A paper describes a structure:
In the case of the glutaredoxin that is the focus of this study, glutaredoxin A from the cyanobacterium Synechocystis sp. PCC 6803 serves as the preferred electron donor for the 2-electron reduction of arsenate to arsenite, catalyzed by arsenate reductase. As part of the thioredoxin superfamily, glutaredoxin A shares the characteristic thioredoxin fold. The structure of the wild-type protein is comprised of the major protein secondary structure elements: four α-helical segments, and four mixed parallel: anti-parallel β-strands that form a single β-pleated sheet. Our random mutagenesis approach has yielded four new crystal structures of glutaredoxin A, one for each of the following variants: R27L, A75I, A79S, and P84R.
The P84R mutation is interesting from a structural perspective. Firstly, Pro84 occurs at the beginning of an α-helix that is bent by almost 90° relative to a neighboring α-helix in the structure. The only impetus for this dramatic bend is the maintenance of a protected hydrophobic core. A proline is present at this locus in other glutaredoxin molecules, but not all. As proline does not provide a free backbone amide hydrogen to form an H-bond to the i + 4 backbone carbonyl, it rarely occurs within a helix. In the wild-type glutaredoxin structure, there is only one i, i + 4 backbone H-bond interaction to stabilize α-helix 4. While mutation of Pro84 to arginine does not restore the complete backbone H-bond pattern typical of α-helices, it does appear to alleviate strain on the peptide backbone so an additional i, i + 4 backbone H-bond interaction can form between the backbone carbonyl of Asp83 and the backbone amine of Ser88. The R27L crystal structure lacks two neighbors; the A75I and A79S mutant have no net differences, while the P84R mutant adds three possible interactions.
Residue numbers in the entry: -10 to 88
The structure:
């Protein structure tokens, strides 16, 4: 396989699992999406507009919270828009993303 390949016992390649539950038109969700997009990271958005079943699935993972958005990185609950911005302002978010 021609190319410039990195080796460090990675095995099968996998990357940060980044998830965000949103309503598309929530201004807090929009602000959080903008931050993740500006980082350039690959991520999954669960847009749950009008979907109560999905909100209950979200609350089950997010400490019972139904507020939006809810963000997870590598299966760890990070919190909402304020939480991710606070992490970035503290110089801690890139390391979680990771780098």
């Amino acid at each position: 396989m021609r190319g410039s390949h990195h080796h460090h016992h990675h095995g099968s390649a996998v990357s940060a699992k980044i998830e965000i539950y949103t309503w598309s038109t929530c201004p807090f969700c929009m602000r959080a999406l903008a931050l993740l997009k500006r980082k350039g990271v690959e991520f999954q958005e669960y847009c749950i507009d009008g979907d109560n079943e999905a909100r209950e699935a979200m609350a089950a993972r997010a400490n019972g919270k139904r507020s939006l958005p809810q963000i997870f990185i590598d299966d760890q609950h990070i919190g909402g828009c304020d939480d991710i911005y606070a992490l970035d302002g503290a110089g801690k978010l890139d390391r979680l993303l990771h780098s």
